[PDB]
């Protein structure tokens, strides 16, 4: 009953003093801070009541202590925490979309589907999502902001069966990404952020709109040839459009 | 409603004296002409009766004052006004055909159709119609004739739905263009115009006949594969014929 | 008159049911709808009073019935009808500008003017306007919006005489286009449309500002050399600037 | 000596009538205007009180007479004087930054410093600032606006000693330039100027953010290797980063 | 009311001790020096009388204290302060000429002038002046001399109207530059400076004489064709000489 306890206590004691630099002081202040954090954790667990609210309070405490006196940054100029949280959520959504596209590329590449062009297209889309996520991370690093990488969620659907359901899921994901981008643009406009707004509306929407249009065209073509009730239509769309 | 009155009176006062050259006389004769035209318009409107006949009489007056003493031309030799009117009608029909082809290219390029090859073919046809119209305009300018550009009419059909109706409309439009060209040839033969007749029968019919034959072949192929009751036939004709 | 009656009744009966698909039901519901529309037209013509208000009411009815339950679109996300109407008006203005530039190119290419460089420049400007109009149409199609192509108006001036009046008309047309673009930008900003705003301010204004500056420079050069009271100045500006 | 009096009176008499065109009238109206301006200056100097307020009133009078009836411009459409003043201040700041970068490049190129890579980098930065200033001037000229070139201020620091102080000064200058650009963007947004806003946020911020990030990285590298208390660290950063 | 006081006191306290090196002593001697300078400024402001003479005395004190015991230089051999002041004045004149040429290039590039060849020529002349100024700065740095960058003065004329006045101003500026170069040569000859004399008479006069000759030829051509009373002459000189 101490493994999970050790894992949950080794987070705050590392978030408080993350750089144990031995090129200055000794290592007794670190031990004092560890003992103080252990006592605080003990008393707050004694004064607890449940388990989920305890984890929520721990997360809130970690988020509060990580914004104390870190000298802000050297290149950060006029940037609110709401824009940072929006960028973090957008990066998380980009990573989730890349994971979903990777799962789609690996599903159509199996033996029960046998569709190489769809797998290659989904792999290219996953690579584009990864490049967009890396570009967002680099832009956030250039603006002097922290990046809080959370846990990447797993795709809710693993068996795509045919191809129409996968196209509908991709279209819904692209619509959600577009809605998130619109919310980010609105938040940057309401919080005075011209550079991020211009960067998002220039080097991101120009590709997202084209991707949404291509997915809509693919769905329209699939919903007219005879899919999913036409096995030859899928082969024709495979050996011509993405082939 | 005086804005319409000003817009309808600013046409004749500009058609009478279209070149207010300040490198000679002053600007009192122009004012006298404007006052005379205003008085004429006033008395004619007081001696009117309806609205459509008034516009028809104004159009007839404009057409009759634009053929007064403009020294004809310096390169115009043996050319009747009937041939000029026929060339103007042919140019108007060419512009209408180009507009219809542009509308067809922009309709198939949407998201509810998703047909890129048909859109590219219609765009190429619109470009060919535009080049033919420009060539007709240049030929009319080289013969010393006036060009009366009217208003380009809008396509009567905006929702082409499938592709068979668009092909039938294009075939009917090409048949109408061929009939207009035959009427122009007959009028030029009856009015002694060998140069225009030869130019039309050489540098125009050779492409119109091929276009009509190609459209007929496309219609025959669509009316045998299973269109419009076959979604795969449209994709096959897209990814092979125009692809 | 019954030909005009047939032409005006064949619009609503085609706008109500535009896709007579024979791959499902028969053709008796279409006949019933045609009879109902004919009865409606008859009673509304019996309950009429004039002619212009009748056409206005018919246009309003057509515009109302074309926004019923067409499933909106598959790629349309956050887009008000005001922005669509503004895009339609901008496309109409672009087509009118292209027509005016074509008329200018064909006027200077005649025998009474003899200016090939001005004609080539006006033809290039008309081609640029056509490309911009096609790009606007493609952008509207990618956003899931309808395109209502109206009637292209004819140029109010046909005899440009010299070149200074043509330059002034082109400058006024460019100023009107810039004002329309500013109004479109303001409407997109007030209706929350970041993508269209960015696209218009990036891939359109960068060329419109340069065109306005070039036309202003040409007007300044013409209003200093001696035009229009200097025949050699026009030849010098032709065989150097646009030559 | 009347040197200063003549120098201060030769500015208003040249700002009132700046174009003594001899291709029209004679030269007696110019003499009358000069005499009137001399009488006005005499009476205003008799009704003066100090020296600094006199120069301020003269500057205000010059600024108010230079906005009388100059026909505005031929390409200026929707542009307030506040945006023009902001563009002038931005151009002045760009010129000051270019002068400071030139001074930095010439200081490190001396014999008491002996740093060629830093001098080359500062010269490249000065060239970039000069190109940005020329681009701003060209953009202001294309919008039909006046450019009021003031006096370029001298750098407050001439002896940069080491390299860390120069990097801190460059970082502060870049932060001031970014703040000025943000103020210009806010003023253009509050005064309805989409074209200038887009141009500034596209063709200027993309380089300013990268320059600020590079300067921050250089400062971070210098504040970790041992500078300024490490002579070898400067040589290592010279013969690797900028070498 | 203390902003100007702080700005004027932060000059001497920085000129006395310009290198606050923390790699040796502490920071109490700097505070003592600042307090002493503040007391000196206080007593000398109490013992003042006017404002302009106060600034002159401050400038003289700054110039005196900047020549105390800076170990002269390591490459400076036989070089009097008069030659250094002459080089500084020549550099200031070169910067002023570059600024005037930039203003001329930006004025002719506007919309009310429309002269691209003149603008390009003036930009090339400004680039040549900038290169000459950089070469002079590098030569002064190689001789072990200080460079006192003052404030660049603004051009006295902003509205050049035509082109003849601009050519006359450029000719007068080139004559002033030639006179300054002759004075510098005479001062270097009277103070025994063969290297600087040879460098100035070789790598500077060879271009200045050619520039003066070209400007004289341009003025002679403009004063014979009909300028400024001939609008076609300016266009001919633009589209042939500098075109």
Question: How is A203-218 classified by DSSP, letter by letter?
Answer: TTHHHHHHHHHHHHHH
Whether C222 and C238 have beta carbons less than 8 Å apart is answered as no
CB pairs under 8 A between A and C: 32
Task: Please name the residues in contact with E158: beta carbons below 8 A apart, sequence gap of 6 or more.
Answer: D18, D147, D148, D149, E103, E107
Contacts of B23 in chain C (CB under 8 A): 228-229
Of A78, A142, A202, the CB nearest to D182: A78
Contacting partners of chain D (3+ CB pairs under 8 A) = A, C, E
CA-to-CA separations, C121 to B140, B142, C108, C116, C155, in angstroms, rounded = 20, 19, 10, 9, 18
Q: Chain C residues contacting A, CB < 8 Å?
A: 74-75, 77-78, 142-144, 192, 194-195, 197-198, 202
Phi, psi of D122 (to 5 degrees): -70, -35
CATH topology of domain C81-239: Ferritin (1.20.1260)
Contacts of C210 in chain E (CB under 8 A): none
Q: By three-state DSSP, how is residue E85 classified?
A: helix
Phi, psi of A152 (to 5 degrees): -75, 125
**Per the annotation, does C208 bind a ligand?**
yes
Q: Is A71 left (phi over 0), alpha (psi -120 to 50) or beta?
A: left
Of C220, C226, C240, the CB nearest to E111: C220
Cα(E113)–Cα(C224) distance, integer angstroms: 9
DSSP chain C: --HHHHHHHHHHHHHHS-----SSS-SHHHHHHHHHHHHHHHHHHHT---SHHHHHHHHHHHHHHTSSSS---SS--S--HHHHHHHHHHHHHHHHHHHHHHHHHHHHTSTTT--HHHHHHHHHHHHHHHHHHHHHHHHHHHTT------PBPPPS-----SSHHHHHHHHHHHHHHHHHHHHHHHHHHHTT-HHHHHHHHHTTHHHHHHHHHHHHHHHHHHHHHTTTS-HHHHHHHHTTT--
Cα(B183)–Cα(E133) distance, integer angstroms: 77
Residues of chain B with CATH 1.10.246.20: 1-66
Q: What residue ranges in E14-105 does DSSP mark as E strands?
A: none
Say if E and D touch: at least 3 Cβ pairs within 8 Å. Answer: yes
Q: In units of Å, what resolution does this entry have?
A: 2.6
CB pairs under 8 A between B and C: 97
DSSP conformation class of E24 = S
Nearest-neighbour CA in chain E from D83: distance (Å): 18
Number of helical (H) and strand (E) elements in chain B, helices listed first: 9, 0
Subunit contact A179:C75, Cβ cutoff 8 A: no
First to last CA, chain C: 55
Subunit contact C241:E239, Cβ cutoff 8 A: yes
- What is chain A's alpha carbon radius of gyration, rounded to the nearest angstrom? 24
DSSP chain A: --HHHHHHHHHHHHHHS-----SSS-SHHHHHHHHHHHHHHHHHHHT---SHHHHHHHHHHHHHHTSSSS---SS--S--HHHHHHHHHHHHHHHHHHHHHHHHHHHHTSTTT--HHHHHHHHHHHHHHHHHHHHHHHHHHHTT------PPPPPS-----SSHHHHHHHHHHHHHHHHHHHHHHHHHHHTT-HHHHHHHHHTTHHHHHHHHHHHHHHHHHHHHHTTTS-HHHHHHHHTTT--
Half-sphere exposure of C14 (CA within 13 A, CB side): 13
Contacts of A78 in chain D (CB under 8 A): 182
Neighbours of E27 (CB within 10 A): 9
Contacting partners of chain C (3+ CB pairs under 8 A) = A, B, D, E
Which three-class secondary structure string do you get for E103-128?
HHHHHHCCCCCCCHHHHHHHHHHHHH
CATH number for B1-66: choose from 1.10.760.10, 1.10.246.20, 3.30.390.50, 1.10.3720.10: 1.10.246.20
Neighbours of C57 (CB within 10 A): 12
Subunit contact D205:A192, Cβ cutoff 8 A: no
Cα(D173)–Cα(D179) distance, integer angstroms: 10
Of C142, C143, C198, the CB nearest to A202: C198
Q: Does D228 sit behind a cis peptide bond, omega within 30 degrees of 0 on the bond before it?
A: yes
Nearest-neighbour CA in chain E from D190: distance (Å): 27
Mutate to test the interface with A, among D170, D173, D184, D209 (most CBs of A within 10 A): D209
Token code pair at residue B21: 């050259």
Of C175, C213, C219, the CB nearest to D142: C213
Give Cα D80 distance to the centre of its chain. Answer: 20
Neighbours of E229 (CB within 10 A): 11
CA-to-CA separations, A170 to A105, A113, B63, E47, in angstroms, rounded = 12, 18, 61, 82
Cα(B163)–Cα(B177) distance, integer angstroms: 21
Paired residues of C152 in beta bridges? B152
Paired residues of D152 in beta bridges? E152
Question: CA quadruple C55, C56, C60, C63: dihedral positive or negative?
Answer: positive
Cα(D150)–Cα(D95) distance, integer angstroms: 10
Q: Chain A residues contacting C, CB < 8 Å?
A: 171, 175, 178-179, 182, 185-186, 197-198, 201-202, 205, 209-210, 212-213, 216, 219-220
Cα(C40)–Cα(B200) distance, integer angstroms: 47
Token code pair at residue A189: 């406009």
Phi, psi of D152 (to 5 degrees): -75, 125
Q: Does C32 sit behind a cis peptide bond, omega within 30 degrees of 0 on the bond before it?
A: no
Contacts of D212 in chain A (CB under 8 A): 75
Cα(D83)–Cα(D143) distance, integer angstroms: 11
Whether B184 and B205 have beta carbons less than 8 Å apart is answered as no
Q: Which of A147, A127, A126 is nearest to A136 (CA)?
A: A147
Cα(A30)–Cα(A24) distance, integer angstroms: 13
Residue of C nearest to E161 (CA): C224
Residues of chain B with CATH 1.20.1260.10: 81-239
Q: What residue ranges in chain B does DSSP mark as E strands?
A: none
Residue-level length of chain A: 243
Cα(C9)–Cα(C49) distance, integer angstroms: 18
Which three-class secondary structure string do you get for E199-230?
HHHHCCHHHHHHHHHHHHHHHHHHHHHCCCCC
Mutate to test the interface with E, among D70, D76, D149 (most CBs of E within 10 A): D149
Task: Please name the residues in contact with C171: beta carbons below 8 A apart, sequence gap of 6 or more.
Answer: C212, C215, C216, C219, D74
Q: Which of A174, A241, A185, A172 is nearest to A207 (CA)?
A: A174
Subunit contact D106:E159, Cβ cutoff 8 A: no
- What is chain E's alpha carbon radius of gyration, rounded to the nearest angstrom? 24
Q: Does C228 sit behind a cis peptide bond, omega within 30 degrees of 0 on the bond before it?
A: yes
Neighbours of A235 (CB within 10 A): 13
Paired residues of B152 in beta bridges? C152
Cα(C231)–Cα(C67) distance, integer angstroms: 57
Whether C95 and C71 have beta carbons less than 8 Å apart is answered as no
Neighbours of B84 (CB within 10 A): 18
Subunit contact A224:B239, Cβ cutoff 8 A: no
Mutate to test the interface with C, among A175, A182, A196 (most CBs of C within 10 A): A182
Subunit contact A195:D175, Cβ cutoff 8 A: no
Task: Please name the residues in contact with B76: beta carbons below 8 A apart, sequence gap of 6 or more.
Answer: B143, B144, B145
Classify residue D35 by burial, with Cβ atoms within 10 Å: 0-12, 13-18, 19+: exposed
Nearest-neighbour CA in chain C from E232: distance (Å): 5
Whether E137 and D105 have beta carbons less than 8 Å apart is answered as no
Q: Which helix (H) or strand (E) holds D9?
A: helix D3-16
Rounded to 5°, angle at Cα E65 from E59 and E70 = 140
Whether E136 and E94 have beta carbons less than 8 Å apart is answered as yes
Mutate to test the interface with C, among E235, E236, E237 (most CBs of C within 10 A): E235
């Amino acid at each position: 009953t101490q493994d999970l306890r050790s894992h949950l206590v080794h987070k705050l004691v590392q978030a408080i003093f993350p750089c144990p630099d031995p090129c200055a002081l000794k290592d007794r202040r670190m031990e004092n801070l560890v003992a103080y954090a252990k006592k605080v954790e003990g008393d707050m667990y004694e004064s607890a009541n449940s388990r989920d609210e305890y984890y929520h309070l721990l997360a809130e405490k970690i988020y509060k202590i990580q914004k104390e006196l870190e000298e802000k940054s050297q290149v950060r100029q006029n940037y609110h925490q709401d824009a940072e949280a929006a960028i973090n959520r957008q990066i998380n959504l980009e990573l989730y979309a890349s994971y979903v596209y990777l799962s789609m590329s690996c599903y159509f590449d199996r033996d029960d589907v046998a569709l190489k062009n769809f797998a290659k297209y989904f792999l290219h889309q996953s690579h584009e999502e990864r490049e967009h996520a890396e570009k967002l991370m680099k832009l956030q690093n250039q603006r002097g902001g922290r990046i809080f990488l959370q846990d990447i969620k797993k795709p809710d659907r693993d068996d795509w069966c045919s191809g129409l359901n996968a196209m509908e899921s991709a279209l819904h994901l692209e619509k959600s990404v577009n809605q998130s981008l619109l919310e980010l643009h609105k938040l940057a406009t309401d919080k005075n952020d011209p550079h991020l707004c211009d960067f998002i509306e220039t080097y991101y929407l120009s590709e997202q709109v084209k991707s949404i249009k291509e997915l809509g065209d693919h769905v329209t073509n699939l919903r007219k040839m005879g899919a999913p009730c036409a096995g030859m239509a899928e082969y024709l769309f495979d050996k011509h459009t993405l082939g």
